[PDB]
Design a protein around this ligand. Structure first.
Ligand SMILES: [Cl-]
Lengths: 129, 112
């Protein structure tokens, strides 16, 4: 699924991301735009042979089990295929886990580069939430 | 950035080691902390279990975390590194090169 902007904002609000760990909803919408172009089915392979999966490009070396990784860390305790669904629940729940420790939203490098320091509220402007 | 001090130190057996880390340039709050050791030129890194000899002092306000190693012996020689944990305290030296954490530049410790 390729979400529309307001469609995603509304979905992420229902899923409890607004002000989660102090990050306003616009952060999450902007992050998804720049990570996945709003595409739930997005995958990107990395140099280390891991892959980033789904709307929030969550990495298989650390966060999900791809079923072919010896000693899979699988810190979100999910198959990576759960991250490739038009239903964003598993991606959101994994994102909540990630953001609650470590480097916060810096875990999404596209956020650091395209979102952090901008008027992220713009990403929910004109939306009915 | 995690600024780890000192870069090197020599100690005598029976002395204690203190390494200090401070997280700089971060908009986020200090989460879990991790400490790693590579016994001199062995060529593998390992997470240190906090406790006993290994006493951590954290100040989340100043985003500072420090390790004191007591009762040093020659076997404690090597390189030590501090870092941010993930997922509620998971530690692994490969986090140091990931998008998910930061680590200090390391301390080369010699014990006579
Ligand atoms: Cl790819």
């Amino acid at each position: 699924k390729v979400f529309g902007r307001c469609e995603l904002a509304a979905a992420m609000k229902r899923h409890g991301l607004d002000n989660y760990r102090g990050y306003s909803l616009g952060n999450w919408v902007c992050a998804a735009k720049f990570e996945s172009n709003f595409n739930t089915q997005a995958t990107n392979r990395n140099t280390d042979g891991s892959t980033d999966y789904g709307i929030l490009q969550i990495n298989s070396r650390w966060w999900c089990n791809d079923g072919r990784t010896p000693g899979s860390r699988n810190l979100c305790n999910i198959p990576c295929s759960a991250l490739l669904s038009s239903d964003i629940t598993a991606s959101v729940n994994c994102a909540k886990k990630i953001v609650s420790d470590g480097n916060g939203m810096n875990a999404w490098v596209a956020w650091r580069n395209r979102c952090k320091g901008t008027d992220v509220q713009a990403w929910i402007r004109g939306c009915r939430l | 950035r995690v600024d780890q001090t000192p870069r090197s130190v020599t100690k005598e057996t029976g002395e204690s080691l203190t390494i200090n880390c401070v997280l700089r340039d971060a908009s986020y709050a200090l989460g879990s902390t991790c400490w790693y050791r590579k016994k001199s030129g062995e060529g593998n890194e390992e997470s240190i279990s906090k406790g006993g000899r290994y006493v951590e002092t954290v100040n989340s306000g100043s985003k500072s975390f420090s390790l004191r190693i007591n009762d040093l012996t020659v076997e404690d020689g090597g390189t030590y590194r501090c870092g941010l944990g993930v997922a509620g305290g998971y530690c692994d030296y490969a986090l140091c090169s990931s998008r998910y954490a930061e680590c200090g530049d390391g301390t080369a410790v010699t014990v006579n």
